[PDB]
User: Fold thymidylate synthase from Escherichia coli.
Amino acid sequence: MKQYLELMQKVLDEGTQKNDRTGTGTLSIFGHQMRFNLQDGFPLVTTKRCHLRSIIHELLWFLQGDTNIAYLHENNVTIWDEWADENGDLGPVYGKQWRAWPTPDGRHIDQITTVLNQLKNDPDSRRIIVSAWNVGELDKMALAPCHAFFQFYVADGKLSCQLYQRSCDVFLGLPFNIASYALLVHMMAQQCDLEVGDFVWTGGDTHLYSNHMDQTHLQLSREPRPLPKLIIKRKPESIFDYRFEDFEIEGYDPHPGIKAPVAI
Amino acid sequence: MKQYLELMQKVLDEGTQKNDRTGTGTLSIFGHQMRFNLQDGFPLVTTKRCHLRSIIHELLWFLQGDTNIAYLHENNVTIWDEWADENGDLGPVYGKQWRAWPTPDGRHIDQITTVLNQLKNDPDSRRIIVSAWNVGELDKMALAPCHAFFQFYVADGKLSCQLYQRSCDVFLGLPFNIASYALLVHMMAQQCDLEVGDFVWTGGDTHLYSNHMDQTHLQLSREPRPLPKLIIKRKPESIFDYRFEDFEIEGYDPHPGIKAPVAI
Ligand SMILES: Cc1nc2ccc3ccc(CNc4ccc5c(c4)CN([C@@H](CCC(=O)O)C(=O)O)C5=O)cc3c2c(=O)[nH]1
Ligand SMILES: Cc1nc2ccc3ccc(CNc4ccc5c(c4)CN([C@@H](CCC(=O)O)C(=O)O)C5=O)cc3c2c(=O)[nH]1
Ligand SMILES: O=c1ccn([C@H]2C[C@H](O)[C@@H](COP(=O)(O)O)O2)c(=O)[nH]1
Ligand SMILES: O=c1ccn([C@H]2C[C@H](O)[C@@H](COP(=O)(O)O)O2)c(=O)[nH]1
Assistant:
């Protein structure tokens, strides 16, 4: 994608060499924002092949409030396995914060159903936020959240979303993080009889790891193909009721996949 | 300043007319970012006179964990007055979350001590964040956090900071919020022997209120002037014991302070 290839070119031309907790070394910039008008096409990378199945299953997993990896295993998703303890638990991560943020006095707030009730009764609110950054439970999480915070806004009967991502692995994580959030914006728009607006991505530490530089220069020498189409074949009774097979992706024809190591 | 003024015209050319909680009406955009190189001077507006004594007093009030406007009265800062209960209290707002985010298990977390220790021991960290968006406590706050989430970054001996401001009053609040955080970046750079870097601002619902258009049109015809320079006259034993006496701006030659109606 134009926006994606241009962030890669910007971290290569402006990135400073940093060290990081996984030992691997990075090229790094701080502060970046880009926008995708979701009516132009579904924002899934065409310069290397990505796999929808995985983006969808992790999204369904977040929406049920799940933080154990067995659901993901049942549907062949492996990326969470190094962080999981012996019982497959990742601790209070995304799915838990989304659906059941713990308050000081006993309570639990479901941030997803709150947001659906704000878009319905009060779409002009400036407080239609979902946060995963629970400072209090961060010591209990397998990984502190990268895509930590997001805000929805409604305009001419169109739903927009902005995500604050504190840390971003440009080459490996970001194809999946933007497809994940753009999918949640078609799901919340369908539920609210709203049209799709913009998905705005903002990054804190936006980086390329040192052992991704050949890969990066190969992908960037590929010109983008036309952006694919998302078809939802079913409007479920609630947002928690989407199954994998409601979603069809049309017109997706990518360049060959490019592999690269995950820094631990 | 040119970034701030470019944003102001953008909200007029492109802003959607929205109804808001006050009734006043607004012109609005979603998703906007601004980079301020702090080497080039202090980012306090020159097109209208801003009063540094109130900026510096609100911020020392935050850093001490205080949610009662008593301190701000001793030192004449008003603005938090319609939101305070008869005992002068705002609920667990900014300062309470910066210094004492409360767990489910009784304990508290001092996010400013955490963040100073991370800057003094692990500067490459992509988790040097402090959040004021405490979901389990939003209902006990008089007004939910506008400047909600920020992240620090260390690259070539320089300290940078990025802010997420969910809802923004371009005319009134935004001049004060840019100086306030740029100021914090200077106190943190000083306590941690780092040079100052970039201050990056990211907004959600960025808006201009209807009854501000005249003052905005007056401001857009005035040219910006050179930025001031912030001298910090001493080096305190901790970031918690700074004082009004310690801050000085050389080179501030603004246009007159412009009066404009606040919305309740
Ligand atoms: C350094 C780093 N660490 C991470 C650790 C946790 C993550 C969890 C999820 C995601 C983003 N979500 C997905 C969700 C599914 C897949 C992938 C990523 C990557 N992908 C693997 C497939 C793994 C496999 O062989 O089965 C791939 O590289 O193609 C997936 O199918 C990124 C990370 C990162 C990440 O991208 N970078
Ligand atoms: C509509 C609106 N509501 C707010 C809610 C309370 C706020 C609290 C803090 C700040 C930002 N902090 C400061 C810090 C200093 C000053 C002001 C605000 C406003 N101001 C007034 C004086 C104080 C007053 O309005 O009572 C001025 O003359 O410009 C100050 O000197 C803005 C708001 C807004 C805000 O920006 N706009
Ligand atoms: O959704 C995800 C999850 C993780 N990461 C990356 C960010 C960093 O490269 C790494 C997490 O390491 P820290 O930032 O916590 O150090 O994983 C992503 O890009 N996207
Ligand atoms: O630091 C601050 C505090 C408040 N506001 C503004 C944001 C909105 O204009 C209004 C708060 O209204 P809500 O967003 O909460 O609805 O005050 C600022 O811009 N900066």
Q: What stands out?
A: Residues A 20-21, 144, 146-147, 167-169, 173-174, 177; B 126-127 surround 2'-deoxyuridine 5'-monophosphate (ligand 3) (CB under 6 Å). The beta strands of chain A are 16-18, 26-37, 101-102, 108-109, 129-131, 147-154, 158-169, 195-209, 229-232, 247-250. Chain A has one domain: 1-264. Chain A touches chain B through 45 residues (CB under 8 Å).
